[model samples]
Target: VNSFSGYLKLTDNVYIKNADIVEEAKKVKPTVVVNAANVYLKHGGGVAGALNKATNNAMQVESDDYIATNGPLKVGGSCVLSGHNLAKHCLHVVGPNVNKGEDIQLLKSAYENFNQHEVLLAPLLSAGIFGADPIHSLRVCVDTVRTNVYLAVFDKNLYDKLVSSFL
Candidate 1:
Protein backbone atom coordinates (compact mmCIF):
# COMPACT_ATOMS: atom_id res chain seq x y z
CA VAL A 1 0.00 0.00 0.00
CA ASN A 2 2.67 2.48 1.03
CA SER A 3 5.11 1.43 -1.61
CA PHE A 4 6.69 3.44 -4.40
CA SER A 5 6.50 2.27 -7.99
CA GLY A 6 10.28 1.76 -7.69
CA TYR A 7 12.94 1.70 -5.01
CA LEU A 8 16.73 1.97 -4.43
CA LYS A 9 18.12 0.79 -1.15
CA LEU A 10 21.40 2.30 -0.05
CA THR A 11 21.31 0.22 3.11
CA ASP A 12 18.85 -1.48 5.42
CA ASN A 13 17.31 1.86 6.20
CA VAL A 14 18.37 4.35 3.48
CA TYR A 15 16.09 4.34 0.45
CA ILE A 16 14.76 6.41 -2.43
CA LYS A 17 11.28 7.63 -3.40
CA ASN A 18 10.32 8.58 -6.90
CA ALA A 19 7.23 10.36 -5.63
CA ASP A 20 6.08 13.60 -4.13
CA ILE A 21 8.33 14.96 -1.37
CA VAL A 22 5.50 16.19 0.79
CA GLU A 23 3.79 12.83 0.45
CA GLU A 24 7.00 11.01 1.32
CA ALA A 25 7.48 13.35 4.26
CA LYS A 26 4.18 12.24 5.74
CA LYS A 27 4.87 8.57 5.14
CA VAL A 28 8.43 8.66 6.47
CA LYS A 29 7.63 11.00 9.38
CA PRO A 30 11.32 11.54 9.79
CA THR A 31 13.04 12.95 12.80
CA VAL A 32 14.19 15.81 10.62
CA VAL A 33 13.57 17.01 7.10
CA VAL A 34 16.61 18.71 5.66
CA ASN A 35 15.99 21.84 3.63
CA ALA A 36 18.25 22.67 0.69
CA ALA A 37 18.44 26.39 1.14
CA ASN A 38 20.57 29.43 0.41
CA VAL A 39 22.67 31.20 3.02
CA TYR A 40 20.05 33.84 3.82
CA LEU A 41 17.46 31.24 4.93
CA LYS A 42 15.41 32.12 1.88
CA HIS A 43 12.89 29.33 1.89
CA GLY A 44 11.73 30.54 -1.50
CA GLY A 45 12.16 27.64 -3.90
CA GLY A 46 12.73 23.90 -4.27
CA VAL A 47 12.34 21.61 -1.26
CA ALA A 48 13.17 24.53 1.00
CA GLY A 49 9.98 26.35 0.01
CA ALA A 50 7.82 23.25 0.19
CA LEU A 51 9.06 22.22 3.64
CA ASN A 52 8.65 25.76 4.88
CA LYS A 53 5.07 25.80 3.69
CA ALA A 54 4.50 22.30 5.03
CA THR A 55 5.58 23.37 8.51
CA ASN A 56 3.45 26.51 8.42
CA ASN A 57 6.67 28.58 8.47
CA ALA A 58 7.38 27.57 12.05
CA MET A 59 11.11 27.09 11.37
CA GLN A 60 11.44 30.41 9.61
CA VAL A 61 11.98 32.34 12.80
CA GLU A 62 14.83 30.11 13.96
CA SER A 63 16.19 29.91 10.44
CA ASP A 64 16.22 33.69 10.36
CA ASP A 65 18.11 33.83 13.61
CA TYR A 66 20.87 31.63 12.21
CA ILE A 67 21.24 33.84 9.18
CA ALA A 68 21.17 37.11 11.13
CA THR A 69 23.59 36.01 13.82
CA ASN A 70 25.82 33.71 11.82
CA GLY A 71 25.71 35.82 8.67
CA PRO A 72 24.54 33.32 6.07
CA LEU A 73 25.29 29.63 6.47
CA LYS A 74 28.14 28.17 4.43
CA VAL A 75 27.62 25.48 1.84
CA GLY A 76 28.39 22.60 4.17
CA GLY A 77 26.67 24.30 7.12
CA SER A 78 23.21 23.54 8.55
CA CYS A 79 20.80 24.53 11.31
CA VAL A 80 18.02 22.73 13.15
CA LEU A 81 14.55 23.79 14.27
CA SER A 82 11.91 22.22 16.49
CA GLY A 83 9.27 20.70 14.25
CA HIS A 84 5.85 22.24 14.16
CA ASN A 85 4.21 21.11 10.93
CA LEU A 86 6.29 18.04 10.11
CA ALA A 87 9.04 15.79 11.47
CA LYS A 88 10.40 16.07 15.00
CA HIS A 89 12.94 18.61 13.75
CA CYS A 90 14.00 20.45 10.60
CA LEU A 91 17.60 20.77 9.40
CA HIS A 92 18.51 23.58 7.03
CA VAL A 93 21.58 23.54 4.81
CA VAL A 94 22.87 25.96 2.19
CA GLY A 95 24.48 23.94 -0.57
CA PRO A 96 27.06 25.11 -3.07
CA ASN A 97 26.01 27.20 -6.05
CA VAL A 98 27.57 25.94 -9.30
CA ASN A 99 30.73 24.02 -8.56
CA LYS A 100 29.96 20.42 -9.30
CA GLY A 101 32.79 19.05 -7.18
CA GLU A 102 32.22 21.53 -4.41
CA ASP A 103 28.49 21.04 -4.54
CA ILE A 104 28.75 17.31 -4.15
CA GLN A 105 31.16 17.60 -1.26
CA LEU A 106 29.08 20.25 0.47
CA LEU A 107 25.90 18.29 -0.02
CA LYS A 108 27.65 15.26 1.41
CA SER A 109 28.67 17.28 4.41
CA ALA A 110 25.13 18.46 4.88
CA TYR A 111 23.79 14.93 4.66
CA GLU A 112 26.47 13.61 7.00
CA ASN A 113 25.56 16.18 9.63
CA PHE A 114 22.08 14.79 10.17
CA ASN A 115 22.50 11.15 9.20
CA GLN A 116 22.95 10.24 12.89
CA HIS A 117 19.19 10.40 13.43
CA GLU A 118 16.77 7.50 13.13
CA VAL A 119 15.12 8.86 10.00
CA LEU A 120 15.68 11.83 7.72
CA LEU A 121 13.76 13.11 4.71
CA ALA A 122 15.90 14.84 2.14
CA PRO A 123 15.45 16.32 -1.30
CA LEU A 124 17.67 15.32 -4.22
CA LEU A 125 20.06 18.13 -3.39
CA SER A 126 21.27 20.13 -6.44
CA ALA A 127 19.72 17.61 -8.75
CA GLY A 128 16.26 18.81 -9.68
CA ILE A 129 15.34 22.48 -9.73
CA PHE A 130 18.91 23.27 -8.74
CA GLY A 131 20.77 21.43 -11.53
CA ALA A 132 22.83 18.30 -12.41
CA ASP A 133 21.49 14.87 -13.33
CA PRO A 134 19.73 13.20 -10.40
CA ILE A 135 21.44 9.85 -9.95
CA HIS A 136 25.04 10.89 -9.38
CA SER A 137 24.03 13.65 -7.03
CA LEU A 138 21.74 11.21 -5.26
CA ARG A 139 24.62 8.77 -5.02
CA VAL A 140 26.51 11.34 -3.05
CA CYS A 141 23.75 11.58 -0.49
CA VAL A 142 23.42 7.83 -0.22
CA ASP A 143 27.14 7.21 -0.11
CA THR A 144 27.80 9.82 2.52
CA VAL A 145 24.97 9.19 4.91
CA ARG A 146 24.89 5.95 6.86
CA THR A 147 21.42 6.21 8.38
CA ASN A 148 17.82 6.02 7.27
CA VAL A 149 17.59 8.46 4.37
CA TYR A 150 14.34 8.86 2.47
CA LEU A 151 14.89 10.74 -0.76
CA ALA A 152 11.82 12.60 -2.08
CA VAL A 153 11.29 12.41 -5.79
CA PHE A 154 8.36 13.44 -8.05
CA ASP A 155 8.92 11.54 -11.28
CA LYS A 156 7.82 7.99 -11.97
CA ASN A 157 9.97 7.36 -15.01
CA LEU A 158 13.08 8.56 -13.26
CA TYR A 159 12.14 6.40 -10.34
CA ASP A 160 11.75 3.43 -12.63
CA LYS A 161 15.03 4.28 -14.29
CA LEU A 162 16.78 4.35 -10.96
CA VAL A 163 15.36 0.98 -10.04
CA SER A 164 16.32 -0.41 -13.42
CA SER A 165 19.81 1.00 -13.18
CA PHE A 166 20.40 -0.57 -9.81
CA LEU A 167 18.85 -3.86 -10.82
Candidate 2:
Protein backbone atom coordinates (compact mmCIF):
# COMPACT_ATOMS: atom_id res chain seq x y z
CA VAL A 1 0.00 0.00 0.00
CA ASN A 2 3.01 2.29 0.48
CA SER A 3 3.38 2.51 -3.29
CA PHE A 4 1.05 5.51 -3.41
CA SER A 5 3.70 7.30 -5.45
CA GLY A 6 3.79 4.34 -7.80
CA TYR A 7 0.17 5.15 -8.54
CA LEU A 8 0.70 8.94 -8.34
CA LYS A 9 3.75 9.24 -10.60
CA LEU A 10 1.74 7.41 -13.22
CA THR A 11 -0.51 10.47 -13.59
CA ASP A 12 1.60 12.86 -15.76
CA ASN A 13 4.74 14.77 -14.78
CA VAL A 14 5.34 12.63 -11.70
CA TYR A 15 8.25 10.45 -12.67
CA ILE A 16 10.17 7.55 -11.22
CA LYS A 17 13.65 6.73 -12.40
CA ASN A 18 13.03 2.97 -12.63
CA ALA A 19 9.37 2.06 -11.91
CA ASP A 20 8.42 2.47 -15.59
CA ILE A 21 5.12 4.29 -14.89
CA VAL A 22 6.07 7.08 -17.24
CA GLU A 23 7.08 4.64 -19.94
CA GLU A 24 3.75 2.80 -19.87
CA ALA A 25 1.48 5.90 -19.93
CA LYS A 26 3.28 7.34 -22.95
CA LYS A 27 2.13 4.35 -24.96
CA VAL A 28 -1.50 5.50 -24.80
CA LYS A 29 -2.04 8.91 -26.27
CA PRO A 30 -5.35 10.81 -26.52
CA THR A 31 -6.59 8.82 -23.57
CA VAL A 32 -9.17 10.61 -21.43
CA VAL A 33 -7.01 11.82 -18.54
CA VAL A 34 -8.39 12.50 -15.04
CA ASN A 35 -5.50 13.13 -12.69
CA ALA A 36 -6.24 12.28 -9.04
CA ALA A 37 -2.71 12.10 -7.77
CA ASN A 38 -2.07 14.70 -5.09
CA VAL A 39 0.76 17.21 -5.53
CA TYR A 40 3.34 18.87 -3.27
CA LEU A 41 4.61 21.92 -5.13
CA LYS A 42 7.12 24.22 -3.55
CA HIS A 43 6.56 28.00 -3.84
CA GLY A 44 6.51 29.03 -7.52
CA GLY A 45 5.10 25.68 -8.59
CA GLY A 46 2.61 26.39 -11.35
CA VAL A 47 -0.04 24.49 -13.33
CA ALA A 48 2.27 24.04 -16.30
CA GLY A 49 5.04 22.81 -14.03
CA ALA A 50 2.70 20.37 -12.36
CA LEU A 51 1.42 19.12 -15.71
CA ASN A 52 4.88 18.79 -17.14
CA LYS A 53 5.96 16.90 -14.05
CA ALA A 54 2.88 14.76 -13.66
CA THR A 55 2.19 11.79 -15.93
CA ASN A 56 -1.47 12.71 -16.59
CA ASN A 57 -1.75 16.44 -15.83
CA ALA A 58 -1.47 17.21 -19.54
CA MET A 59 -4.23 14.74 -20.28
CA GLN A 60 -7.25 16.04 -18.30
CA VAL A 61 -8.86 19.03 -16.65
CA GLU A 62 -9.50 19.36 -12.91
CA SER A 63 -13.06 20.40 -12.08
CA ASP A 64 -11.63 22.90 -9.57
CA ASP A 65 -9.23 24.38 -12.11
CA TYR A 66 -5.88 23.10 -10.88
CA ILE A 67 -6.31 20.53 -8.14
CA ALA A 68 -3.73 22.07 -5.79
CA THR A 69 -1.24 24.85 -6.31
CA ASN A 70 2.29 23.84 -7.21
CA GLY A 71 4.43 25.77 -4.76
CA PRO A 72 8.17 26.38 -4.33
CA LEU A 73 10.38 23.36 -4.26
CA LYS A 74 12.09 22.72 -0.89
CA VAL A 75 9.38 24.54 1.03
CA GLY A 76 11.12 23.17 4.08
CA GLY A 77 11.78 20.00 5.92
CA SER A 78 8.82 17.92 7.17
CA CYS A 79 5.86 20.27 7.69
CA VAL A 80 3.73 20.76 10.72
CA LEU A 81 0.25 19.26 11.23
CA SER A 82 -1.74 21.78 9.20
CA GLY A 83 -4.23 21.88 6.33
CA HIS A 84 -1.53 22.25 3.67
CA ASN A 85 0.02 18.82 3.41
CA LEU A 86 0.22 16.87 0.17
CA ALA A 87 1.30 13.47 1.51
CA LYS A 88 0.57 13.02 5.19
CA HIS A 89 -0.73 9.45 5.38
CA CYS A 90 -0.85 9.71 9.19
CA LEU A 91 -4.55 10.62 8.91
CA HIS A 92 -5.61 7.00 8.46
CA VAL A 93 -5.23 6.66 12.19
CA VAL A 94 -8.52 8.55 12.61
CA GLY A 95 -10.12 8.31 9.20
CA PRO A 96 -13.65 7.10 8.68
CA ASN A 97 -14.31 3.53 7.78
CA VAL A 98 -12.96 2.38 4.44
CA ASN A 99 -16.58 2.11 3.25
CA LYS A 100 -17.77 5.40 4.67
CA GLY A 101 -21.18 6.67 3.66
CA GLU A 102 -22.53 10.26 3.94
CA ASP A 103 -21.25 11.27 7.37
CA ILE A 104 -20.58 14.95 6.90
CA GLN A 105 -19.62 15.46 10.53
CA LEU A 106 -16.89 12.88 10.25
CA LEU A 107 -15.55 14.88 7.35
CA LYS A 108 -16.00 18.14 9.20
CA SER A 109 -14.00 16.85 12.09
CA ALA A 110 -11.15 16.07 9.75
CA TYR A 111 -11.44 19.43 8.04
CA GLU A 112 -11.21 21.35 11.28
CA ASN A 113 -8.01 19.56 12.05
CA PHE A 114 -6.32 20.59 8.79
CA ASN A 115 -5.34 24.04 10.03
CA GLN A 116 -1.83 24.74 8.69
CA HIS A 117 -0.61 22.05 6.29
CA GLU A 118 -0.40 22.46 2.55
CA VAL A 119 -3.66 21.54 0.85
CA LEU A 120 -3.79 18.59 -1.53
CA LEU A 121 -6.05 17.69 -4.44
CA ALA A 122 -5.86 13.93 -4.51
CA PRO A 123 -7.26 12.65 -7.80
CA LEU A 124 -9.10 9.37 -7.78
CA LEU A 125 -5.89 7.56 -8.46
CA SER A 126 -7.50 4.29 -7.37
CA ALA A 127 -10.04 4.73 -10.13
CA GLY A 128 -7.56 6.22 -12.60
CA ILE A 129 -4.91 3.58 -12.06
CA PHE A 130 -7.42 0.79 -11.52
CA GLY A 131 -9.32 1.68 -14.72
CA ALA A 132 -12.49 2.78 -12.95
CA ASP A 133 -14.62 5.65 -14.24
CA PRO A 134 -13.06 9.05 -13.50
CA ILE A 135 -16.42 10.58 -12.55
CA HIS A 136 -16.81 8.06 -9.79
CA SER A 137 -13.56 9.19 -8.21
CA LEU A 138 -14.36 12.86 -8.67
CA ARG A 139 -17.71 12.50 -6.90
CA VAL A 140 -16.03 11.03 -3.87
CA CYS A 141 -13.38 13.77 -3.74
CA VAL A 142 -16.05 16.46 -3.81
CA ASP A 143 -17.39 15.16 -0.55
CA THR A 144 -13.94 14.40 0.77
CA VAL A 145 -12.58 17.89 0.15
CA ARG A 146 -15.51 19.31 2.05
CA THR A 147 -14.70 17.14 5.01
CA ASN A 148 -11.00 17.80 4.70
CA VAL A 149 -11.47 21.57 4.84
CA TYR A 150 -13.45 21.07 7.98
CA LEU A 151 -10.72 18.95 9.44
CA ALA A 152 -8.20 21.61 8.56
CA VAL A 153 -9.60 23.57 11.45
CA PHE A 154 -9.42 20.75 13.96
CA ASP A 155 -6.74 18.27 12.94
CA LYS A 156 -5.10 19.13 9.65
CA ASN A 157 -2.38 16.65 10.36
CA LEU A 158 -4.66 13.65 10.31
CA TYR A 159 -6.79 15.09 7.54
CA ASP A 160 -3.88 15.71 5.20
CA LYS A 161 -2.51 12.27 5.84
CA LEU A 162 -5.77 10.61 4.86
CA VAL A 163 -7.25 12.99 2.23
CA SER A 164 -6.13 10.80 -0.67
CA SER A 165 -5.18 7.27 0.34
CA PHE A 166 -8.69 5.84 0.16
CA LEU A 167 -8.29 5.18 -3.52
Candidate 3:
Protein backbone atom coordinates (compact mmCIF):
# COMPACT_ATOMS: atom_id res chain seq x y z
CA VAL A 1 0.00 0.00 0.00
CA ASN A 2 1.11 3.57 -0.55
CA SER A 3 2.02 5.20 2.74
CA PHE A 4 3.10 8.67 3.62
CA SER A 5 6.36 9.18 5.51
CA GLY A 6 5.06 12.16 7.44
CA TYR A 7 1.92 14.28 7.50
CA LEU A 8 0.80 17.67 8.80
CA LYS A 9 -2.71 18.98 9.27
CA LEU A 10 -2.73 22.56 8.09
CA THR A 11 -6.43 23.25 8.58
CA ASP A 12 -9.86 21.63 8.59
CA ASN A 13 -9.63 20.80 4.91
CA VAL A 14 -5.99 21.32 4.00
CA TYR A 15 -3.02 19.04 4.75
CA ILE A 16 0.52 18.34 3.68
CA LYS A 17 2.24 15.04 3.03
CA ASN A 18 5.82 13.98 2.77
CA ALA A 19 5.64 11.82 -0.33
CA ASP A 20 6.56 11.72 -3.98
CA ILE A 21 4.35 14.09 -5.94
CA VAL A 22 4.20 11.95 -9.03
CA GLU A 23 3.59 8.73 -7.11
CA GLU A 24 1.05 10.26 -4.81
CA ALA A 25 -0.73 11.91 -7.71
CA LYS A 26 -1.09 8.51 -9.29
CA LYS A 27 -2.53 7.05 -6.13
CA VAL A 28 -4.60 9.95 -4.80
CA LYS A 29 -5.91 11.01 -8.22
CA PRO A 30 -6.12 14.65 -7.30
CA THR A 31 -8.15 16.97 -9.50
CA VAL A 32 -4.92 18.30 -10.91
CA VAL A 33 -1.19 17.93 -10.38
CA VAL A 34 0.76 21.15 -10.27
CA ASN A 35 3.83 21.55 -12.45
CA ALA A 36 6.52 23.92 -11.21
CA ALA A 37 6.72 25.45 -14.63
CA ASN A 38 8.78 28.18 -16.21
CA VAL A 39 7.18 31.00 -18.19
CA TYR A 40 7.69 29.09 -21.41
CA LEU A 41 5.87 26.03 -19.97
CA LYS A 42 8.67 23.81 -21.15
CA HIS A 43 8.88 20.51 -19.35
CA GLY A 44 12.64 20.38 -19.60
CA GLY A 45 13.78 19.71 -16.02
CA GLY A 46 12.97 19.12 -12.39
CA VAL A 47 9.34 18.30 -11.57
CA ALA A 48 8.23 19.33 -15.02
CA GLY A 49 10.68 16.93 -16.60
CA ALA A 50 9.57 14.10 -14.39
CA LEU A 51 5.94 14.68 -15.23
CA ASN A 52 6.67 14.97 -18.90
CA LYS A 53 8.54 11.69 -18.79
CA ALA A 54 5.78 10.01 -16.83
CA THR A 55 3.21 11.10 -19.37
CA ASN A 56 5.34 9.95 -22.27
CA ASN A 57 6.02 13.55 -23.29
CA ALA A 58 2.39 14.13 -24.12
CA MET A 59 2.33 16.81 -21.48
CA GLN A 60 5.20 18.50 -23.23
CA VAL A 61 3.40 18.46 -26.54
CA GLU A 62 0.32 19.90 -24.91
CA SER A 63 2.44 22.51 -23.18
CA ASP A 64 3.97 23.47 -26.48
CA ASP A 65 0.55 23.85 -27.99
CA TYR A 66 -0.56 25.98 -25.06
CA ILE A 67 2.41 28.27 -25.35
CA ALA A 68 1.96 28.54 -29.08
CA THR A 69 -1.57 29.73 -28.53
CA ASN A 70 -1.09 31.89 -25.44
CA GLY A 71 2.56 32.83 -25.45
CA PRO A 72 4.79 32.50 -22.37
CA LEU A 73 3.20 32.43 -18.96
CA LYS A 74 4.00 35.34 -16.67
CA VAL A 75 5.24 35.15 -13.11
CA GLY A 76 2.36 34.05 -10.88
CA GLY A 77 0.35 33.02 -13.94
CA SER A 78 -1.04 29.52 -14.49
CA CYS A 79 -2.82 27.38 -17.04
CA VAL A 80 -4.37 23.93 -17.10
CA LEU A 81 -3.23 21.26 -19.49
CA SER A 82 -4.05 17.64 -20.10
CA GLY A 83 -2.47 15.42 -17.48
CA HIS A 84 -2.05 12.68 -20.12
CA ASN A 85 -1.50 9.43 -18.22
CA LEU A 86 -1.10 10.99 -14.79
CA ALA A 87 -4.42 12.55 -13.81
CA LYS A 88 -7.39 14.52 -15.00
CA HIS A 89 -5.53 17.82 -15.44
CA CYS A 90 -2.12 19.33 -15.01
CA LEU A 91 -1.98 22.82 -13.56
CA HIS A 92 1.11 24.69 -14.70
CA VAL A 93 2.12 27.68 -12.61
CA VAL A 94 5.09 30.01 -12.86
CA GLY A 95 6.74 30.84 -9.59
CA PRO A 96 9.01 33.78 -9.01
CA ASN A 97 12.67 33.43 -9.91
CA VAL A 98 14.92 34.68 -7.16
CA ASN A 99 17.66 35.23 -9.71
CA LYS A 100 15.38 37.77 -11.37
CA GLY A 101 14.57 39.61 -8.11
CA GLU A 102 11.09 38.06 -7.90
CA ASP A 103 9.73 37.97 -4.39
CA ILE A 104 7.63 35.67 -2.23
CA GLN A 105 4.46 37.50 -3.20
CA LEU A 106 4.82 36.25 -6.74
CA LEU A 107 5.25 32.74 -5.41
CA LYS A 108 2.17 33.23 -3.26
CA SER A 109 0.27 34.49 -6.29
CA ALA A 110 1.18 31.38 -8.21
CA TYR A 111 -0.55 29.22 -5.65
CA GLU A 112 -3.34 31.71 -5.18
CA ASN A 113 -4.28 31.48 -8.84
CA PHE A 114 -4.91 27.76 -8.68
CA ASN A 115 -8.60 27.04 -9.10
CA GLN A 116 -10.27 25.31 -6.17
CA HIS A 117 -10.43 21.57 -6.30
CA GLU A 118 -10.95 18.68 -3.94
CA VAL A 119 -7.28 17.81 -3.81
CA LEU A 120 -4.04 19.28 -5.16
CA LEU A 121 -0.62 17.73 -5.51
CA ALA A 122 2.34 20.07 -5.85
CA PRO A 123 6.07 20.23 -5.37
CA LEU A 124 7.98 22.99 -3.59
CA LEU A 125 7.87 25.64 -6.28
CA SER A 126 10.90 27.93 -6.83
CA ALA A 127 12.93 25.95 -4.32
CA GLY A 128 14.77 24.16 -7.06
CA ILE A 129 16.57 26.02 -9.86
CA PHE A 130 14.59 29.20 -9.34
CA GLY A 131 16.42 29.45 -5.99
CA ALA A 132 13.70 30.22 -3.47
CA ASP A 133 14.65 29.09 0.05
CA PRO A 134 13.03 25.74 0.77
CA ILE A 135 11.75 26.69 4.18
CA HIS A 136 10.22 29.92 2.95
CA SER A 137 8.74 28.24 -0.09
CA LEU A 138 7.25 25.52 2.06
CA ARG A 139 5.74 28.10 4.38
CA VAL A 140 4.14 29.93 1.46
CA CYS A 141 2.65 26.70 0.12
CA VAL A 142 1.18 25.79 3.48
CA ASP A 143 -0.39 29.18 3.87
CA THR A 144 -1.81 29.49 0.36
CA VAL A 145 -3.12 26.03 -0.39
CA ARG A 146 -6.86 26.04 0.23
CA THR A 147 -7.76 22.45 -0.58
CA ASN A 148 -6.29 19.16 0.50
CA VAL A 149 -2.68 19.32 -0.67
CA TYR A 150 0.20 16.95 -0.68
CA LEU A 151 3.50 18.82 -0.56
CA ALA A 152 5.89 16.38 -2.12
CA VAL A 153 9.47 16.53 -0.85
CA PHE A 154 11.77 14.36 -2.95
CA ASP A 155 14.92 15.08 -0.98
CA LYS A 156 15.39 13.21 2.29
CA ASN A 157 17.22 16.08 3.91
CA LEU A 158 14.51 18.55 3.03
CA TYR A 159 11.79 16.15 4.14
CA ASP A 160 13.56 15.82 7.48
CA LYS A 161 13.77 19.59 7.77
CA LEU A 162 10.03 19.97 7.16
CA VAL A 163 9.25 17.18 9.61
CA SER A 164 11.30 18.84 12.29
CA SER A 165 9.47 22.11 11.75
CA PHE A 166 5.86 20.90 11.37
CA LEU A 167 5.55 17.39 12.74
Instruction: Give the Å error, residue 128, model 2.
Output: 2.3
Residue-level error in angstroms, candidate 2, position 69: 32
- lDDT (10s digit) by residue, model 3, range 1-167: 22334567656544566677788777766667889998998888888888888888889888888889889998998888887777788889899988778876888888786546557778888877778987888777767876666678788788778767752
Error of 3 at 43 (Å): 1.0
| Winner by lDDT | 3
lDDT tens readout by residue for model 1, 103-142: 5556677667766676677777666566656776667776
Best by the TM-score measure? 3
Candidate 2: tens digits of C-alpha lDDT, residues 89-129: 21211212223232323333332333332333222322322
CA displacement after TM-score superposition, residue 140 of candidate 3 (Å): 1.5
Best-to-worst ranking by TM-score: 3, 1, 2
TM-score of each: 0.80, 0.22, 0.87
- State each candidate's clash count: 1, 50, 0
Look at candidate 1 and tell me the lDDT of residue 111. Answer: 61
With a 3 Å backbone cut-off (N, CA, C), the pairs that clash in candidate 1 are 19-153
Score residue 61 of candidate 3 by CA lDDT.
85
TM-score of 3: 0.87
